[PDB]
Design a protein around this ligand. Structure first.
Ligand SMILES: *[C@@H]1O[C@H](CO)[C@@H](O[C@@H]2O[C@H](CO)[C@@H](O)[C@H](O)[C@H]2NC(C)=O)[C@H](O)[C@H]1NC(C)=O
Ligand SMILES: CC(=O)N[C@@H]1[C@@H](O)[C@H](O)[C@@H](CO)O[C@H]1O
Ligand SMILES: CC(=O)N[C@@H]1[C@@H](O)[C@H](O)[C@@H](CO)O[C@H]1O
Ligand SMILES: CC(=O)N[C@@H]1[C@@H](O)[C@H](O)[C@@H](CO)O[C@H]1O
Ligand SMILES: *[C@@H]1O[C@H](CO)[C@@H](O)[C@H](O)[C@H]1NC(C)=O
Ligand SMILES: *[C@@H]1O[C@H](CO)[C@@H](O)[C@H](O)[C@H]1NC(C)=O
Ligand SMILES: *[C@@H]1O[C@H](CO)[C@@H](O)[C@H](O)[C@H]1NC(C)=O
Ligand SMILES: *[C@@H]1O[C@H](CO)[C@@H](O)[C@H](O)[C@H]1NC(C)=O
Ligand SMILES: C[C@@H]1O[C@@H](O)[C@@H](O)[C@H](O)[C@@H]1O
Lengths: 137, 170, 38, 198, 49
């Protein structure tokens, strides 16, 4: 039993680990070793304490360089759709009814054209801020 | 459609509207927990404070946790908490208030005991009256212009915290 | 794909992109920061 | 493993899913006798086809409106991400930035860009101290009744002698007059300790 | 005949509700990101901004 509801087919443990899959209200579940699905209260991490008093410091004597990646998405696929081919399928019997709803399809095209113009602004302003094409020695 | 088969037989003519509405709401509901996780959880180890309070005269008992009551939320936190108040369902949040109230207290003990260092590698202990002699040097005020008049500044700090309580009380 | 739905190409090709990023990578190594200011 | 590039895969997954739903929607009847228009036009007269076709028209209209609205909403996330990427590129590649935890998680030296499909990747080079020792300190020293303070770095003592060092890399130096400057007098400051200066 | 009117009403009201919610959440997200930015830049260090 949890705040969230009734959980069937898991074994509670008094131990606690990082959270592979979240259930709710701190309840978390995982598959572990003789293997079964367990559920437990998620741990927040290790616990630490510093010996702080006047006239005591720690000074670092050694160092390490490191590297770290970062990934961002800068563009989206500029789809386009024909309103009247989709709605009417090149049927004149359809189009002479469809033309009673006025300009709707045209403003739809306009909206999509704004997208198709905006996305190649997005690609243009991230790169292309160097005025000359340098090359390595 | 309200538990009526006469309605349910006709509803499915409109295809998958309910499916994309459900995927919309389920896409929304998850994002809040990523927001919460990102805003907090900027610390990898839960620090805790020593029992003594030798902070050079600076008073921190208003914001540090109070262990006596069961929830670890401090006094000002409890004023802030007190000042605000068909198929419809509400899902519980992931991180409970005791977790937030541990995180905040860890951030606090880190910022007090070790200054900024705990954000770039392992924390290091430094006396508070030498942390202030750093943060004053960051605005072109020579550190001695603190050591000469340290006590007065502590008093003003102690006074400035006080008014905030009344500001929240009134 | 025959219902009037279509896709359009980008303006910049991936080789122009790699020219830009190779110019950036040669600049930040040969001239440090200065190539940005002047 | 390819799970590193999870982010820029879900944009493609969402777009393909939305387009597949928009195209599959055509199979629904909306209450007409058939989803196929020629099946109506071959079997029925214009007085009745003009009663029927309005339902399909309204359905496909509102479906295309829903699609356009979803795309109009989604575009602003991509725009805000492109602007954040442009900011990181302008500020952290062309120069060194002091904004803590803006580029990586540590003291920042430099970064390098690489291209990717519908995206970009940065590599951030960061410096971190690993080892640390214990030292005893005093915020000032007394000599001839005058309080001396350090120009840069801090005073430390292993227990027998007093030295001054820079803050982030242990390096002892003999306490000399031009490492320090004089203020006030011994009586005013707490914790000051007696010492000799050269 | 009648029930289609109720269906086309309620479905439109629900679409309007979802459309409000999406915008409101997309507004909240920018305040969440600004909060996390302040947290990261001004608590763990001193900022001359
Ligand atoms: C603290 O550091 C000082 C500085 O190195 C130590 O003093 C040195 O001790 C060695 C002993 O072999 C002498 O040869 C040096 O001439 C001393 N230097 C000076 C400047 O006097 C001192 O022994 C250290 N104390 C402890 C407890 O480690
Ligand atoms: C060292 C110090 O300032 N301790 C104070 C104490 O004197 C005061 O009674 C209490 C309540 O305000 O807060 C704390
Ligand atoms: C006059 C004064 O400061 N009295 C304080 C009181 O307000 C506080 O509740 C108590 C415990 O902190 O300590 C004392
Ligand atoms: C906060 C503070 O220090 N206030 C003092 C006050 O006590 C004193 O009456 C006055 C005269 O010197 O100077 C000021
Ligand atoms: C947790 O441990 C206690 C004592 O060690 C035990 O009595 C209890 O049964 C354990 N929890 C569960 C759910 O069994
Ligand atoms: C702070 O210094 C005083 C004397 O200056 C000392 O009595 C006290 O124990 C110190 N506090 C510590 C070591 O926590
Ligand atoms: C520590 O110093 C040694 C040499 O003294 C060096 O080889 C090592 O890379 C440094 N960093 C560590 C051990 O993290
Ligand atoms: C420094 O001294 C304290 C007190 O004995 C000890 O807890 C700590 O492990 C020592 N080393 C460092 C790096 O703080
Ligand atoms: C310097 C060493 O670490 C710290 C303290 O526990 C003692 O001063 C010990 O001698």
């Amino acid at each position: 039993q949890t705040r969230a509801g009734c959980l069937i087919g898991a074994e509670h443990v008094n131990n606690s680990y990082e959270c592979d899959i979240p259930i709710g209200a701190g309840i978390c579940a995982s598959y572990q070793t003789s293997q079964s699905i367990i559920a437990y209260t998620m741990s927040l991490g290790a616990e630490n304490s510093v010996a702080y008093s006047n006239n005591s410091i720690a000074i670092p004597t050694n160092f390490t360089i490191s590297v770290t990646t970062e990934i961002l998405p800068v563009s989206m696929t500029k789809t386009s759709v024909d309103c009247t081919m989709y709605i009417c399928g090149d049927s004149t019997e359809c189009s002479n009814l469809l033309l009673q709803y006025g300009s709707f399809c045209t403003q739809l095209n306009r909206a999509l054209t704004g997208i198709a113009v905006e996305q190649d602004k997005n690609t243009q302003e991230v790169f292309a801020q160097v005025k000359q094409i340098y090359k390595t020695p | 459609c309200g538990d009526s088969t006469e309605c349910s037989n006709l509803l499915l003519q409109y295809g998958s509207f309910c499916t994309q509405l459900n995927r919309a709401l389920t896409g929304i509901a998850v994002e809040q927990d990523k927001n919460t996780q990102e805003v907090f959880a900027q610390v990898k180890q839960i620090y805790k404070t020593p029992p003594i309070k030798d902070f050079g005269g600076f008073n921190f008992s208003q914001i540090l946790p109070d262990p006596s009551k069961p929830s670890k939320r401090s006094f000002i936190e409890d004023l802030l908490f007190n000042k605000v108040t068909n198929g419809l369902t509400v899902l519980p949040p992931l991180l409970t208030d005791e977790m937030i109230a541990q995180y905040t207290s860890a951030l606090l003990a880190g910022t007090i005991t070790s200054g900024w260092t705990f954000g770039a590698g392992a924390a290091l202990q430094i006396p508070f009256a030498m942390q202030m002699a750093y943060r004053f040097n960051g605005i072109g005020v020579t550190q001695n212009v603190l050591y000469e008049n340290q006590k007065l500044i502590a008093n003003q700090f102690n006074s400035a915290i006080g008014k905030i309580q009344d500001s929240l009380s009134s | 794909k025959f219902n009037g739905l279509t896709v359009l190409p980008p303006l910049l090709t991936d080789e122009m992109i790699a020219q830009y990023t190779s110019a950036l990578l040669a600049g930040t190594i040969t001239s440090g920061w200065t190539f940005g200011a002047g | 493993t390819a799970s590193a590039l999870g982010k820029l895969q879900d944009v493609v997954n969402q777009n393909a899913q939305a387009l597949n739903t928009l195209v599959k929607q055509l199979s629904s009847n909306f209450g007409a006798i058939s989803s196929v228009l020629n099946d109506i036009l071959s079997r029925l007269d214009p007085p009745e086809a003009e009663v029927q076709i309005d339902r399909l028209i309204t359905g496909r209209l509102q479906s295309l409106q829903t699609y356009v609205t979803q795309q109009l909403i989604r575009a602003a996330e991509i725009r805000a991400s492109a602007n954040l990427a442009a900011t990181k590129m302008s500020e952290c590649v062309l120069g060194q930035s002091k904004r803590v935890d803006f580029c990586g998680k540590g003291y920042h030296l430099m970064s390098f860009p690489q291209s990717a499909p519908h995206g970009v990747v940065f590599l951030h080079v960061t410096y971190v101290p690993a080892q640390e020792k214990n030292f005893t300190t005093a915020p000032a020293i007394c000599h001839d009744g005058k309080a001396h303070f350090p120009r840069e770095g801090v005073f430390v003592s292993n227990g027998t002698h007093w030295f001054v060092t820079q803050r982030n890399f242990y390096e002892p130096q003999i306490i000399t007059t031009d490492n320090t400057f004089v203020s006030g007098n011994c009586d005013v400051v707490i914790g000051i300790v007696n010492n000799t200066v050269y």
